[PDB]
Design goal:
Largest interface: B-C, 61 and 64 residues
Order of helices and strands of chain D: HHEHHHHEHHHEHHHH
Shape of chain D: elongated
Organism (chain A): Rattus norvegicus (Rat)
Family (chain A): Belongs to the glutamate-gated ion channel (TC 1.A.10.1) family. NR1/GRIN1 subfamily.
Strand content of chain D: under 5%
Helix content of chain D: 40-55%
Subcellular location (chain A): Cell membrane; Postsynaptic cell membrane; Synaptic cell membrane; Postsynaptic density membrane
Strand content of chain C: under 5%
Radius of gyration of chain C: 32 Å
Bound molecules: a molecule of 2 linked components (NAG-NAG), 2-acetamido-2-deoxy-beta-D-glucopyranose
Oligomer: part of a larger assembly
Structural class of chain D: mainly alpha
Structural class of chain C: mainly alpha
Protein name (chain C): Glutamate receptor ionotropic, NMDA 2A
Order of helices and strands of chain C: HHEHHHEHHHEHEHHH
Protein name (chain A): Glutamate receptor ionotropic, NMDA 1
Helix content of chain C: 40-55%
Radius of gyration of chain D: 33 Å
């Protein structure tokens, strides 16, 4: 089941060009209202981009005897835009969770699989015979028999290299491998809750004391000690989101310093 | 209610106009009367002879005292083993009626905990006193320092390391109010849904308590469908203590908060949910049943009537009959404003009174 | 043709496979009891108006009432004891938002107290409005373009500048049902003819088809197995025929009563429900962009009205 | 006593009901194969908790701080360059620029060189999107929910002695049970502190846990999972799933010398080996799943107040 926040560069030319041309037209018509008075152009541009700035700037108030109404409308306009933008970007990055799992054997997409849901088992596995006995596992048996693998490490490398897409395996081993390799994430449901013992001979008197020694390991905390050996020991980021943001900010800073060189050469 | 009494009254609704449409289609007259009891009629034992008999609508039909049961009857297997049934016109399932949607104060200042708010106020007070002491130990000045502290605290009305630490505290307070904004956002993310588990296979429903009061209609086909089911002895013994004659009895019982669950048809309780919003249905569509017309045996008015219903299926007859009353139905800015407006108005009145006091002194 | 050409011509006994039920098919053979709720439905693909008039309906009034009260307070404070007589409106409504509006250095103590109280009120109102927009995004409805069989779009595709498209399989019973409802709908569907079911599925996935008409539960199954829940029906069979499926036996077949009782046994015990659980995928449930269009356009219309008001105040 | 006294003294054949497994029962009779994974578990009070709003390390993670310092130094250096083109905002430009992060800085007299205004506009748009991302992280923090548990596991310090912590508590078991035998074979001090805190009935112990007559209890795992699957209110979810517990099974104790044993084992492995045991577990085990939530934000208030007092001491001594 495995970036740039879509601010201006992944999003198309609606919001940035719209706000830029809008504040341009607003600044031009308010400076033309300043012409019809009932570095003044630079002061009007500073006032317009300070209202669009909405974070604090050491500016005054120009001759706005009738421009103040359009200025306050544009100010409330800009703040309700940036408030709605903050709200829906946050709510966009909250509910951005699609369906990226199988939910167990009861999946009709796996009852009738295709070339995408690649699931298989180990070659000559007891789970294969366990599914071959049962009454409805015929299509999954025909799907798994095509790509049986020798070792489980082959299955791990195949599902790591996107050759597989699902694999039936014991749960705690997959939890240990998820602790080791964090890219391998299983599903949530659990099935075939079974017991695993030791492959033994027929009825032997030493076999009885072997089973009693296993029970002696059960009654004390030595099973928990074996869990301490293997089972218990497990193992808005703005580094892809706001990193290229700072790259374009630094490029804009270099270009703005170049424009300041142009302005000082002009004046 | 009554031992035996009969009055002529007015009947209308769905199946009445359906019979009018049939009389427009097929040439026949009517004799419209009501069922004697308030039961569908189950296969109950008669008082002797160890024999079970049907009654109710079947008891009125099989006696020759009825010709056609024009009613959306739950067509089961058992009643079709005896007499012939028509084609089911209605496809309708089962649902559970509960009493949900019980909510406001929104935790702004007075429903919000003012202990940490007074802690923030005393903290910025101690910070302002300490910065005035650093002004005294320099390497309306007190009033200017207090006004600057309480103005930068609220980010409005704002006119060397002391101001640096004060602006550290100001950004810290903006972190505080951003956490407050997130807390008020988390206040209105979700409600409390599913106070009763709607799962029919819930072991909490299989072993109920004294609070779980669920009932059914006395002697219905739903009771027969439960009687077939081989593991429904517990709910049968529960609902037999609360056998209800009419469905309006269950409507009045859950209306007075005496019931908690009721197995019933879907669209009826959907229309009752349109009536009252606290009467809430469920979404589990189980036992998708077919409702037709109660009919006799092999009859010349059987196949013609079935073909008439089939001819009625193609047009929008059931469509605009659903448009009559079935389709016909009958957080925001307003919740989080009222007590806020009243508290801010009272604070403004008290502040103006304190300004009268201060101008009377100054 | 087909199963009707096999059973009625007595080369087949009955149609145990699925079959639609209508007038003349019931005239030629006898169907069984309905065992599944399969009407008809329309499949379409994936994909607010304003935020001031419905939402800020009556809060707007009390905000203006308290704004006039606080403005009268500021006028009385300035007139008790340098330009805040009529210019308190711009200052006060800039401090409504706290847009860092450059107005004046506040020397009035009562003015600073009222500005502090109103700024705290503005912060908590901004928090409440962000929570309102969050709950508005949580309450996420998905409206459709067509919510009616008697649509004005279903009368002429010149109703809107892109004409949409929808068809069925040829020589089908659904075509006969449409021709028994509207011949003009068949005339518009004549230009929208296509052959295959999965061919229409490929046309819906690639975008070579707008809408599609088929049965209800089969399209529900197709939407359950839909890759990414890209295809959602219009409703759940509201403005449709609401028919069913049966087993068409011959007129006079003695097996009809036993098969009907067997189907009534198979439905009313959870066996049919077990088969529906086994054979219907339902992962795509209900109630599950970054650029709205109508809201800022309506604010643009109010902005054009503000241009008109600015012109009125400029000429006089 | 009980079923062991019935079977071993040949008044009963076998116990079909659920039976615990230990060494002495395997010595006196013979168990069957296990079929269900039922260990032990501990039920606690587990009152109302929060989602622990401790801090945030997602945007910066103690690596973007150098970028903040470098960008402040560049802003101050170009402010010095504009001052060279143009009287006290050499280092104070950094103060104004970080005051405009939280949009309430005192406006120092800005030069007409306009370069400072451009970089203030760029940093101000960056502060707008930074506060937007901060509120977005605060909104995304609401998605998960988890309240911490008072017991880490079987090696708890609270399991050692509740005098080590400031509230003392209590814990009981079933009387005369094999769980008590497992305690006395593993932890004698647990039996010592459990003997004075005994109880009578399992549902009675549940009522004692609800009404407040008991704090903790030790029982089997899946039976308490079933009790949570019938719990009124569902306020009790046990810690873990048998990971720090015994994790034993349930079997059928047959008499030593019964020919039924292999047939019963084949029947149990047939009942498991077809999904019918899964059907029985589905039928008999089925369950579901504030104004002062800032109990860890106030720890951040404590640390920031201590850092503010320390920096005030540093700026005051010199
Ligand atoms: C299995 O181990 C047990 C324990 O050592 C043995 O059983 C008992 O052993 C003790 C000590 O040798 C004797 O006093 C008892 O008489 C034994 N009882 C039984 C069950 O006979 C047992 O001998 C061992 N069996 C083997 C050889 O594996
Ligand atoms: C009987 O029905 C037929 C339907 O075509 C038609 O002749 C007329 O409606 C009816 N005639 C009588 C007997 O009124
Ligand atoms: C018949 O009547 C008697 C009157 O007491 C009643 O007890 C009995 O249950 C009735 N039998 C049935 C079930 O018809
Ligand atoms: C309807 O009624 C007529 C006259 O009773 C009968 O002959 C016919 O079979 C029925 N149905 C049809 C096919 O019209
Ligand atoms: C536990 O065992 C003792 C043995 O004397 C007995 O007296 C007591 O009643 C038992 N308690 C219970 C309730 O198990």
């Amino acid at each position: 089941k495995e970036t740039l926040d879509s601010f201006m560069q992944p999003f198309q030319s609606t919001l940035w060009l719209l706000v830029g041309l809008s504040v341009h037209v607003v600044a031009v018509m308010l400076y033309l209202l300043d012409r019809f008075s009932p570095l003044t152009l630079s002061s009007a541009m500073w006032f317009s981009w300070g209202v669009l700035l909405n974070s604090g700037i050491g500016e005054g108030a120009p001759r706005s005897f009738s421009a103040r109404i359009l200025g306050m409308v544009w100010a409330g306009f800009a703040m309700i835009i940036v408030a709605s933008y903050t709200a829906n970007l946050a709510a966009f990055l909250v509910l951005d969770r699609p369906e990226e799992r199988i939910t167990g054997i009861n999946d009709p997409r796996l009852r009738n699989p295709s070339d995408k849901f690649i699931y298989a088992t180990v070659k000559q596995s007891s789970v294969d015979i366990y599914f071959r006995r049962q009454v409805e596992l015929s299509t999954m048996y025909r799907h798994m028999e095509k790509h049986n693998y020798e070792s489980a490490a082959e299955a791990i490398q195949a599902v790591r290299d996107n050759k597989l897409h699902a694999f039936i395996w014991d749960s705690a081993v997959l939890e240990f491998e998820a602790s080791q390799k964090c890219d391998l994430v299983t599903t949530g449901e659990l099935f075939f809750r079974s017991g695993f013992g030791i492959g033994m001979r027929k009825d032997s008197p030493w076999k009885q004391n072997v089973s009693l020694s296993i029970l002696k390991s059960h009654e004390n905390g030595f099973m928990e000690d074996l869990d301490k050996t293997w089972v218990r020991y497990q193992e808005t980021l703005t580094f892809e989101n706001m990193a290229g943001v700072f790259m374009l900010v630094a490029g804009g800073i270099v270009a703005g310093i170049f424009l300041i060189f142009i302005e000082i050469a002009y004046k | 209610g009554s031992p035996r009494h009969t009055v002529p009254q007015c009947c209308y609704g769905f199946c009445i106009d359906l019979l009018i449409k049939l009389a427009r289609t097929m040439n026949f007259t009517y004799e419209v009367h009501l069922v004697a009891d308030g039961k569908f009629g189950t296969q109950e034992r008669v008082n002797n002879s160890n024999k079970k008999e049907w009654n109710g609508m079947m008891g009125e039909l099989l006696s020759g005292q009825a010709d056609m049961i024009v009613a959306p009857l739950t067509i089961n297997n058992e009643r079709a083993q005896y007499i012939e049934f028509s084609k089911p016109f209605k496809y309708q399932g089962l649902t559970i009626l509960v009493k949900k949607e019980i909510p406001t104060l929104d935790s702004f200042m007075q429903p919000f905990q003012s202990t940490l708010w007074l802690l923030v106020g005393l903290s910025v007070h101690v910070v302002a006193v300490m910065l005035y002491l650093l002004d005294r130990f320099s390497p309306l000045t007190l009033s200017s320092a207090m006004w600057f502290s309480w103005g930068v605290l609220l980010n409005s009305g704002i006119g060397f390391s002391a101001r640096i630490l004060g602006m550290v505290w100001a950004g810290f307070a903006m972190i505080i109010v951003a956490s407050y904004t997130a807390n008020l956002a988390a206040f209105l993310v979700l409600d409390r849904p599913e106070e009763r588990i709607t799962g029919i296979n819930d072991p909490r429903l299989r072993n109920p308590s004294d609070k779980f009061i669920y009932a059914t209609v006395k002697q219905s086909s739903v009771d027969i469908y439960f009687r077939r089911q081989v593991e429904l002895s517990t709910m049968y013994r529960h609902m037999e203590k609360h056998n209800y004659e009419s469905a309006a009895e269950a409507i009045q019982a859950v209306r007075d908060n005496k019931l908690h669950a009721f197995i019933w048809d879907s669209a009826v309780l959907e229309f009752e949910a349109s009536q009252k919003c606290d009467l809430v249905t469920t979404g589990e569509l189980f036992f998708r049943s077919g409702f037709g017309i109660g009919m006799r045996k092999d009859s010349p008015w059987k196949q013609n009537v079935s073909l008439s219903i089939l001819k009625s299926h193609e047009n929008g007859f059931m469509e605009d009959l659903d448009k009559t009353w079935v389709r016909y139905q009958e957080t925001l800015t307003f919740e989080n404003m009222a007590g806020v407006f009243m508290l801010v108005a009272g604070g403004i009145v008290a502040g103006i009174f304190l300004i009268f006091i201060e101008i009377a002194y100054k | 043709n087909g199963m009707i050409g096999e059973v009625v011509y007595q080369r087949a006994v009955m149609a145990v496979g699925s079959l639609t039920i209508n007038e003349e098919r019931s005239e030629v053979v006898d169907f069984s009891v309905p065992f599944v709720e399969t009407g008809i439905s329309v499949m379409v693909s994936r994909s607010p108006s304003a935020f001031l008039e419905p939402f800020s309906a009556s809060v707007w009034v009390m905000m203006f009432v308290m704004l006039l009260i606080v403005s009268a307070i500021a006028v009385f404070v300035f007139e008790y004891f340098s330009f805040t007589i009529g210019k308190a409106i711009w200052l006060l409504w800039g401090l409504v938002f706290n847009n860092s509006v450059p107005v004046q250095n506040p020397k009035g103590t009562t003015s600073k107290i009222m500005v502090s109280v109103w700024a705290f009120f503005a912060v908590i109102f901004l928090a409440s409005y962000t929570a309102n927009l969050a709950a508005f995004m949580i309450q996420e409805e998905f409206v459709d373009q067509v919510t009616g069989l008697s649509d004005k779009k279903f009368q002429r595709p010149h109703d809107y500048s892109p004409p949409f498209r929808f068809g069925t399989v040829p020589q089908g019973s659904t075509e006969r049902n449409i021709r028994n409802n509207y011949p003009y709908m068949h005339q518009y569907m004549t230009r929208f003819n296509q052959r295959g079911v999965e061919d229409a599925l490929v046309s819906l996935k690639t975008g070579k088809l707008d809408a599609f008409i088929y049965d209800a539960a089969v399209l529900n199954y197709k939407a359950g197995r839909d890759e990414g829940c890209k295809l959602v029906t219009i409703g759940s069979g509201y403005i449709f025929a609401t028919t069913g499926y049966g087993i068409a036996l011959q007129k006079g077949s003695p097996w009809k009563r036993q098969i009907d009782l067997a189907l009534l046994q198979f439905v009313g015990d959870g066996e049919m429900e077990e088969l529906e659980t086994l054979w219907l995928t339902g992962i795509c449930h209900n109630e599950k962009s970054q650029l709205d269009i109508d809201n800022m356009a309506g604010v643009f219309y109010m902005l054009a009205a503000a241009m008109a008001l600015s012109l009125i105040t400029f000429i006089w | 006593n009980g079923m062991i006294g019935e079977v071993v003294y040949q008044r009963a054949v076998m116990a079909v009901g659920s039976l615990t497994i230990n060494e002495e029962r395997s010595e006196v009779v013979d168990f069957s194969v296990p079929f269900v994974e039922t260990g032990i578990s501990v039920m606690v009070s587990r009152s109302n908790g929060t989602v622990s709003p401790s801090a945030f390390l997602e945007p910066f993670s103690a690596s973007v701080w150098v970028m903040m310092f470098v960008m402040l130094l560049i802003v101050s250096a170009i402010a010095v360059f504009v001052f060279e083109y143009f009287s006290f905002t050499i280092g104070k430009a950094i103060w104004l620029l970080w005051g405009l992060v939280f949009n309430n800085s005192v406006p120092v007299q800005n030069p007409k060189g306009t370069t400072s205004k451009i970089m203030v506009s760029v940093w101000a748009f960056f502060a707008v999107i930074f506060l937007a991302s901060y509120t977005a992280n605060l909104a995304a923090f609401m998605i998960q929910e988890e309240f911490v548990d008072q017991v880490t596991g079987l090696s708890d310090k609270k399991f050692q002695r509740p005098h080590d912590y400031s509230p003392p508590f209590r814990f009981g078991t079933v009387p005369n049970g094999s769980t008590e035998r497992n305690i006395r074979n593993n932890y004698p001090y647990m039996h010592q502190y459990m003997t004075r805190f005994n109880q009578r009935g399992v549902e009675d112990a549940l009522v004692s846990l609800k009404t407040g007559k008991l704090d903790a209890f030790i029982y089997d795992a899946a039976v308490l999972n079933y009790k949570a699957g019938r719990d009124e209110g569902c306020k009790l979810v046990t810690i873990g799933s048998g990971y720090i517990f015994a994790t034993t099974g349930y079997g059928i104790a047959l008499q030593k010398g019964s020919p039924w044993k292999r047939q019963i084992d084949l029947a149990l492995l047939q009942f498991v080996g077809d999904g019918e045991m899964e059907e029985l577990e589905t039928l008999w085990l089925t369950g579901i799943c504030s104004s002062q939530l800032d109990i860890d934000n106030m720890a951040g208030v404590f640390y920031m107040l201590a850092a503010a007092m320390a920096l005030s001491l540093i700026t005051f001594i010199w």
